[PDB]
Amino acid sequence: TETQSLELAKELISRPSVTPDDRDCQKLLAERLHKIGFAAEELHFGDTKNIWLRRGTKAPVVCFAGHTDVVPTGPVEKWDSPPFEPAERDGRLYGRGAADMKTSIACFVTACERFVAKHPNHQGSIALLITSDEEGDALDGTTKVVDVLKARDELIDYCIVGEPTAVDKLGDMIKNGRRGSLSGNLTVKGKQGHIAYPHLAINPVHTFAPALLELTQEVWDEGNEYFPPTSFQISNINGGTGATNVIPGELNVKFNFRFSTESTEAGLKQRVHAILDKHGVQYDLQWSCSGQPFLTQAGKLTDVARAAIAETCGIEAELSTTGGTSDGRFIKAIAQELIELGPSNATIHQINENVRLNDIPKLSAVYEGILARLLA
Template identity: 55%
Template sequence: MSRTLQLAEQLISRPSVTPEDAGCQQILGERLAALGFRLETIEGGPADFRVTNLWAVRPGSADATSARTAAFAGHTDVVPTGPIEQWRSHPFTPTHRDGRLYGRGACDMKTSLAAFVVAIEEFLAATPEPRLTLALLLTSDEEGPARDGTVVVCDTLAARGERIDYCIVGEPTSVERCGDMIKNGRRGTLSGKLTVKGVQGHIAYPHLAKNPVHALAPALAELVAINEAGGWDAGNAFFQPTSWQVSNIHAGTGASNVIPGSAVIDFNFRFSTESTPESLQQRVQAVLDSHGLDHTLSWTLGGLPFLTTPGELVEAVQQAIRDETGIETELSTSGGTSDARFIARICRQVIEMGPVNASIHKIDEHIAVAEIEPLKNIYRRTLERLEALLPT
């Protein structure tokens, strides 16, 4: 059994459902401390939702003018298992079947964490005194609300003036083979809750009431038309056009003979770097105003878009994947959000790269055992290439 596989199994066996860490960070921290890393635990959240974060750093030997910090980042928490009886084996008992390792977190993302640490161990064994500063950022609040996790660590580092130059987030980004896709950016997410006010009344006497659903319908149709026409923005070379989608509409008392007093619609933008939260809010507000709706509208910004254009980190990862697997990887900004959106505030180059994502969050989550060592080797090769960029 490889050391990466062994460590991955140790982590999978810990039932670290958000916000629990269940000792995962201690396991990883002990391995890092033995390599000379300085460990800092940062906790957050209310008493009934305590989040554990780990920031680990090993300073390099480069002088101040050429110093660079390369970090790995990820989460030790996992999503709930779902009905345990539907799993072929217990989700927190690492199990092998047909060349695959099964268990909650096998793909998202405990194998990546194990690969991080073993890659660092091998890199330092070959380069005991690197010029590159190495770091690892871990949280137990990525699969949950993400209010007390990576964002808190990044805010702490920003307040101290600490920077990261390169960061690889171990999210499962691959599609068919390890390394066939990396994320060099993600769209932003902006949610809105619109409440249109009416006057409740008997459905047989509509002249004594005001139906908010009827009032909302023309404005909703206009917003849908803008979206279908791709009218929010055109996207760019890295991003698809901004998308707007309704997630819920609710009105009524449950009775078929009552005109509702209000209608509520929940919607979400996934937006490119061609739009800003302010520009999208203004567009929506203009539509609502043009229809004279009596309404309230609240906004929640879940994350800004980020983009790492091809440069030192992207090229280092691409070459590491090429050397290890022969694959020419695809750059993508598709999919949902990740903690990379917080890291991008303090790091000029951030990418996501990890295992095949077909089974994440599913019953019988798994990873092909044959892809575990290549994943670790890609991480190690990336460190080697970043080290080689620094002047001697």
């Protein structure tokens, strides 16, 4: 069984690339892929490093997308082994970035190496889009690489984002899309006054109550074959001066939508306003959208990934759009078809982050199988 993937993963994890620091990870990757005909293009913005590695000049273009940065280790004393010294233990590889997502990068690199050796005259092109800021605000990250590629008409046919997607076993889940995120900051206005003279006041908690119930019980959409129903959740609610004999003058409420393709920004906003207004609520409602939903329908790419996983892992992969989001929300604008595929996301951002040792050669073989099915 191939051990190149594991060795490279350890090498990447050894570098403490906390966001947005890259610690020469992209330099490492460039120099290695240069050995098999990948040309490198640095696209640095601000303090963020990005790189666009590519072998070939013709379509179909297959792209692996990922990030080299990792989230902070947290309390280093709670770690059973140092987060930046990868260790094998109980059939698992422990280290920050072991699951999210340096292992995926290592697996794809070795997949290119084995694939190119078997098919030197493969059709199309293979590319890697690597950023040093995915976990942060990512203003200088993938979004600007995409803008540059879009502007010069360098489009992708198939993209695989190496984010960890597995629930339990490697390959049990593929992401063919994600929800958008629409946050709202609501300030309901009333009129402060002594609690014993309610008629000389307006309790914002009372006025908002009927609207609050309607919002929490609202069915926004029924989802579809790819998405669960659009989800509404209240994160914070705050009103009162601390005094138990005072009616507050205002009430603050912070809520959020994780919405599918069956809903839009405007549709959700107007409905939320209509609910508030028809209950006679007075308020300042301010809005914020951190991401839009994207989707790749079942097709050639999802079928190919599912087939590669069936051959390598021996299990039936399911499609999904649940969870948070990814840089796929930017890349989809230039990628005809895009999926996310990686190891288990159970330990991401947590202490003692890890991945199964046996899952590493498997993931690399899955990537290689996808390349073979698309380019050979």
